[PDB]
Symmetry: C4
Subunit: 480 residues, 4 copies
Amino acid sequence: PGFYFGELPLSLAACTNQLAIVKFLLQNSWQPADISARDSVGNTVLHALVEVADNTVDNTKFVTSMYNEILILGAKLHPTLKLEEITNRKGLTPLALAASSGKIGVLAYILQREIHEPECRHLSRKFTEWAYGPVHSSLYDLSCIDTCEKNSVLEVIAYSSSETPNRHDMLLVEPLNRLLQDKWDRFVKRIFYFNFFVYCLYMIIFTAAAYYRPVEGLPPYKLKNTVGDYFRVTGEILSVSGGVYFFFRGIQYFLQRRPSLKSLFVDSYSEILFFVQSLFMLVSVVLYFSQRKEYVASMVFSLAMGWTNMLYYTRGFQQMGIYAVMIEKMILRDLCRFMFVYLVFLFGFSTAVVTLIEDSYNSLYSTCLELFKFTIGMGDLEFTENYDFKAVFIILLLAYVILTYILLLNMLIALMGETVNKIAQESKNIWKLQRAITILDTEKSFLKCMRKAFRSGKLLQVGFTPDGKDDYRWCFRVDE
Amino acid sequence: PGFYFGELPLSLAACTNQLAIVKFLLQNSWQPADISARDSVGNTVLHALVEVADNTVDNTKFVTSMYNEILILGAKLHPTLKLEEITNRKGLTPLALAASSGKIGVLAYILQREIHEPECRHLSRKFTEWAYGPVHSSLYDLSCIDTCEKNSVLEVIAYSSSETPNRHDMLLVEPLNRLLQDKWDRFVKRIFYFNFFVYCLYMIIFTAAAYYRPVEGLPPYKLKNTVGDYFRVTGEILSVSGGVYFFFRGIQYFLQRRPSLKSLFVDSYSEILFFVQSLFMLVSVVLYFSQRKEYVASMVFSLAMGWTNMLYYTRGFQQMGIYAVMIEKMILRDLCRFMFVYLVFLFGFSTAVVTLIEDSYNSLYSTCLELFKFTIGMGDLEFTENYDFKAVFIILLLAYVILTYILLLNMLIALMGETVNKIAQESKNIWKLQRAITILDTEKSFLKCMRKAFRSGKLLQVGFTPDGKDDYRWCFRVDE
Amino acid sequence: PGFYFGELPLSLAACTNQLAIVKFLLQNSWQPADISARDSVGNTVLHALVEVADNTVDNTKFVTSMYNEILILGAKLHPTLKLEEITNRKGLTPLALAASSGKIGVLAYILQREIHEPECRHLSRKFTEWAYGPVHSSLYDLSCIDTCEKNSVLEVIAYSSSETPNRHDMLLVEPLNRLLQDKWDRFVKRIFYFNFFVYCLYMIIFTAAAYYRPVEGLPPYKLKNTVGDYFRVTGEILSVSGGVYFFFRGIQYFLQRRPSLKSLFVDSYSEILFFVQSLFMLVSVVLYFSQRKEYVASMVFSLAMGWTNMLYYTRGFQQMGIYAVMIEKMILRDLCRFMFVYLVFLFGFSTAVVTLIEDSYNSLYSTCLELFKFTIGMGDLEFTENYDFKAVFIILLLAYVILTYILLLNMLIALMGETVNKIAQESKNIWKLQRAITILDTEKSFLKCMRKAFRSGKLLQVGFTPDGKDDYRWCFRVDE
Amino acid sequence: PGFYFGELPLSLAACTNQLAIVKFLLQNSWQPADISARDSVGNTVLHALVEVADNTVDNTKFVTSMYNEILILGAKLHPTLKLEEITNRKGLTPLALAASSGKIGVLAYILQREIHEPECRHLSRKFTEWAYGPVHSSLYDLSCIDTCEKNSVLEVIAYSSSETPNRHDMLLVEPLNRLLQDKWDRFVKRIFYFNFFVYCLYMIIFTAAAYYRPVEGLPPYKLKNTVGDYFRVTGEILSVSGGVYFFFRGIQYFLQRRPSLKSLFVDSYSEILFFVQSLFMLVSVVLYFSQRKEYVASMVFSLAMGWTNMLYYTRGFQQMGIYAVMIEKMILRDLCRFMFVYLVFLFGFSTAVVTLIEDSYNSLYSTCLELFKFTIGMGDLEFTENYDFKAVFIILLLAYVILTYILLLNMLIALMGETVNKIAQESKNIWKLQRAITILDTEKSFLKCMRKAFRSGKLLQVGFTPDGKDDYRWCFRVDE
Ligand SMILES: C=C(C)[C@]12C[C@@H](C)[C@@]34O[C@](Cc5ccccc5)(O[C@@H]1[C@@H]3C=C(COC(=O)Cc1ccc(O)c(OC)c1)C[C@]1(O)C(=O)C(C)=C[C@@H]41)O2
Ligand SMILES: C=C(C)[C@]12C[C@@H](C)[C@@]34O[C@](Cc5ccccc5)(O[C@@H]1[C@@H]3C=C(COC(=O)Cc1ccc(O)c(OC)c1)C[C@]1(O)C(=O)C(C)=C[C@@H]41)O2
């Protein structure tokens, strides 16, 4: 049991689409409609009527009409008090809550509503200046999207923990899509490409420095005044510098976002991979000054990861990022599934073969390798000669080949085909979301105290305030 | 010739959906309706009502309406006796018959009917306790589902011999789905995982014991007081103990179910595989004490099967269970086809090549192998030098390679693509059924004389019987 | 030029769906309708009504209704003579013309007529004997199907030259489907399986005889009285006997059907393959007695073909026959398409590599082979050492490998996938047609002067002729 | 700001679909509608009403109806001058603009428009001569298709820079499709096949000449009077002649068309490939007379390209052209995506392995090769023995193999599958366009001052001029 009816029937009325109670509570001498007071849980009716939504057509029309009517009534009953600005216990506005919960219909309303009545046109979002046949030039005077100073809308959407059912669908709406596209086109694109080029130089320097490590053992290695040593040690210093930089940026990301440790591996994939690179790099430098030879064994892993992480920058090239996301999705969702099956078969037949033949392929490891080799097309079928029960041996090997090489790999290919069909359209939206989070971090860091990235301007766009004062809302024009 | 009209026109009325005869026969002074007496073949009219169904929309409405009307009239005319409780020649109730024959519409009715009338409301199934806007709390008086003591519904569905057209679709209805989900969530899950862990330890012990068999010939091998021999012989005793355990459980499964020996290989797949493992294990121990060297040959097959059978426990993880099911389907129904085609090609070209070249690759076996190799990417195209008719030889080999390696394997990949596409959604229902049968065996065995797994309780929820007595039905709540 | 207005307005009326002209021309005192007289090209109006059909819904209803009306009127005006039995210049009845042209709508009508009037219901096809609610037991008096003694319907459909747009679709209609199914179930199945077993013994004997050919040269080989020679020569005699038998079978097929030499390779596939086997076998006999050693070079090509032709008998096992059909389709229509491209690439890069490197891989043949090997996963990339322009060499080889191994073969796999998707349903109908042809030849040959394979009997089922005589039509009962 | 209201509201009526304004402006005594005068940008209202089109159903009907009305009014008010003939600043007619911009609806109308009114029927396109029930014989009097003397519509469609949304759909309309089919059937097909055969002889001669280059160094090589040298030098002269011919033809293509240097690789693929062949050929002859041995390194590339370019002639065989075009698409669109990913992985693990193991495989090149080999199924997993950190080495190699061989290549196969499915239909229209461009170039060149390839003739089929004169328009008959 339990609901928000208690001490607040308006919430239940709006949930129930029974607007008569809502209009009845307005100004009754028995008891007026106190929409403006917050409930015990901290939220308001404007948040409750957001909770009802489920994005379906009938629910969309119900909740949209209910919200618009309730908002107009709030405006006319209490012109001295705004309702959309009142935050809940956590801090979310109805805009913020609808975004966080992934209520695409209510979002579509909140960023596109319009008024054709006097003394309340401050509630409209869309405004028109030029009106031609094929095309119109409308304007959005949205705030609380670029920098709301509590939680910007894009911060709420981009950093959701993948639990929002419309995690990446809502960003396709025009009032956000055009903003992201413009932010990309104006200044973010140059910063991002510059970062890409800087990283590529970083990996080239790291590869060159590592490849020319001095071959004698027992580090550290005394430097000579010759030029090769200045180049090498400079390359090393640049390499470790890059590593520690990534370490700090990774930890800053984690402390700011703090995902749930189950989302940590199914989101924030890129940050953990970069962080792990930096961890290997720092373990390497630690072992390097520790007078151990083993540091190279760590360095290469960073190197091996470093080049691979270059795929992170394929976001920013849609035609290629749409490919690059496939590896993330398959390595996360499909590799564990396949690898358990494959390791079961490999271990089963490998133990059978290795226990069968005993008196050079007498280890379990060597035979695990030899039966792995049938998956890369180098099995030989005669890796042992003059051994007992050879008929049984060959039956086992051919059973293995038929099982894994002929069937299981082909099952893998077919399943990847089906999954690729099932994510034909999803990957594009994932790419757009990846561009969005790229843009957000780009704006957040900004590298040089430069913040001149506002919308089309703070002009007196509306001029119909309920007070006699003037509006300033950083408006933004769209040629529809 | 012949029909079911004889001495029962009500079956014809249902076949034509002519309801007037029902009410006409109801209480006619010439002869009333004797609903309560059984037919000559043992069954009742309500069973005939079940047989007529075909799960389609119009047939569903016709059969549902006629069934409900007949039930109400049976209540009104003969309140002293129940009709659903009367069994047929085999023992099935209309519930049980509808389940066994796969009559999903009538099943959906029987467990979801409702009454809004006095003195017959005991016939209602669904009941309501709380009624909110978005959610309602309903209640079912499900009985004769968990343990009806003649034919439980789950017993009938789970153990159908795969001939029921809706074999796995019946379990999707709420009154069964929620029961299975709760039984899984409550206590079955821990028992199943415990079994899984126990089996994994079993296979580890078996592998370790077998790998370290003593290398000298002529078993049995005299034990030393050193610790290695105590460990090895203990491992052997545990291994053969597990084998005989599986033997007994397999034979118990067969005697309790007794499938039809055509269903035996397309259902009961897991049981026969475990049974075959145990047979190899027991043959191994028989040969072991028989002073035979070749017990190894029977050991390893069990070992090789043992690890493979671990995929049985992949039911229990849906995201992996469907994958293991796909492998089962491909090995069962698709392999025989391809293997016949492939063996025809391999044998044709192998016997042609071996008869061509004669004066080391002169056996049919060696050449069968050499041409098999072209599938796994290790054919050489020059495995013979200085032999007659080399042009003809090479034409044959290239014809073979073009035929099988280039085309037939690609035909296999494409066909697996179509089949995987065609069973993407069926496998989910197969997994759910494979969990249902697991749950049923879990309840049946219960390991420790613990049976406290009943539904929400036998409280006097309804109490609206035409007699003054009370209801005790092991209720069950659903948060709709 | 040329049209249907000339001296036959009835065909034009049919083209225009205007029955008024038909009834007016029917029995006018100025001139009645001479429907029964044949046109100058040999055909009648009933054949014209077939020509106008195009299998669409509206065309179906138009042609069906107008045909029925015209036929009833022809019966009423001229009860002394039948109209459907009058043949055209070639010999086809309207049933035969509709079948040969592939007019599925008219075919469905003509075999399923029904009349509820006296003195004309002799023209109906379907008759009812038992009438229950869900099932009825009807009968067809259909003749001119099994043996019409001029051109049976099944002969017309089965032996069409693949130009019929509904070549295999029309056999799904019940009056033919049930006939074929019963003919299969009754006696054909045993003959077919017997043939299959006989052929399998034939190939086993041939393989054994060929494998043990005497190894010395210069045939023929003098026989010894020892048992091995009696077995070998008996096997040889059986082998050649089988070859010549197939030779006669193939030539009889060609002379009876006489396809068009463009249909010859896209239909009659199985017959030409068996014929080619027999040709190689007879060539081997000729060379054998010609004191040539190279007879073996022909014998193996029979042997290699012989085993492969066993796939012909997969018709008769639907689940496997469909798969063999898919292989036939691919090897016919996709292999030329692919192999042109592949041979172009192989020849281009092979001649480039061979002209590049000159001073053991210096022949065009050896290099054609070496670059072929990259398809089967055995290319080495260093098959030449110490040769000029090695950079150019390696660029060419890697260009080749990237082109064919990585891209072309994967593209072949993808296109086979799409084609397989596009023929999922066609192949089933091809299988049914193949079984139909099997049945027809089985009935035609009949092996022992046994022809007791008629339909349900010539009983006087209808007996409502406009004359006082009785009906004898070899009826056939169907329990619908 | 800015809009085309100024001094021409007729275009605004057209884009607003308000016939009142255009009818009122038509012939008002205050001011008529001066349709015939060009606007400031050079175009007329007939072009404006094309500009607003968007090929949708409603837009199609609006623009079609209004265009027809405007033309009729032009006929009635201004019979002294035609309006469709007035060209814009560039020179396009309304049909030319509709085609160039890809306006399939208006393009379909404007070539098919018909009038059932006297004194203006001269403006119709379609005319009917024979009228049968199932068939009709219509005629098109279209001009400005074969030779417009400014720009034919086929030149407009064929040479669009791939940016037109209906690039290849416009050729599906009857007056163009039938015309192209007939042009192909009449005389073009023999010319094309003759060209194909000539080219095949050219490549055979080139291959033979190059293969038999004299093996001694230091070209040029003194000729002997023996026949082999006359054959070789003649082959060389023919080869270089072919090369220079292609050079001139390619540069003529570029200068006539002059694409945009971004479409230069998106279209004109075939021409640039042939041109590149000729460039390699000319570099080869330059180096040949330059007394350099390196000329062979250029020769082979031409040879290697030469054979490959034979796929250009696979247009002309539709059943194979659809395959060659898909190869072109994959090499252009999919190779860059995959090759970046693959090269990143190959380079990352190659540099990791090569820096790990140092003391023969110490080069980055050799290891880059060795890890490339794992794609073609010849990796060994033990290409180094007795090296430090072998556990780390093997972990890296197996990580590489699992990453690329097992996953990346299979994902490539699946992605090619989805892409080829998404272009199942587009390849057909691409082939038809590729034949259209062939036909147009064939007519342009014509090889021998032969131009007798007009339409069905200048018959006086219309004869409904507002003057008393006759129509001569090179008509063309279509038997619908
Ligand atoms: C059906 C039977 C009786 C079966 C028994 C043996 C002979 C088997 O080969 C087959 C046929 C075969 C032969 C060679 C290659 C593949 C398949 O499939 C199984 C049988 C099948 C397998 C593979 O089995 C599986 O798919 C695992 C599995 C998947 C899903 C399940 O629900 C499951 O139930 C326990 C088991 C492994 C073998 O037992 C094995 O290790 C050896 C040596 C042969 C395999 O015969
Ligand atoms: C169509 C003809 C005349 C054909 C005859 C020979 C040369 C053939 O190669 C082909 C072309 C070819 C060549 C190399 C590889 C594949 C195909 O296909 C068959 C022909 C085809 C095959 C494969 O045939 C089949 O698909 C079996 C089959 C399937 C379905 C059937 O209905 C069927 O009817 C009997 C046979 C085997 C060969 O006869 C053979 O063993 C050799 C040495 C070459 C094969 O030419």
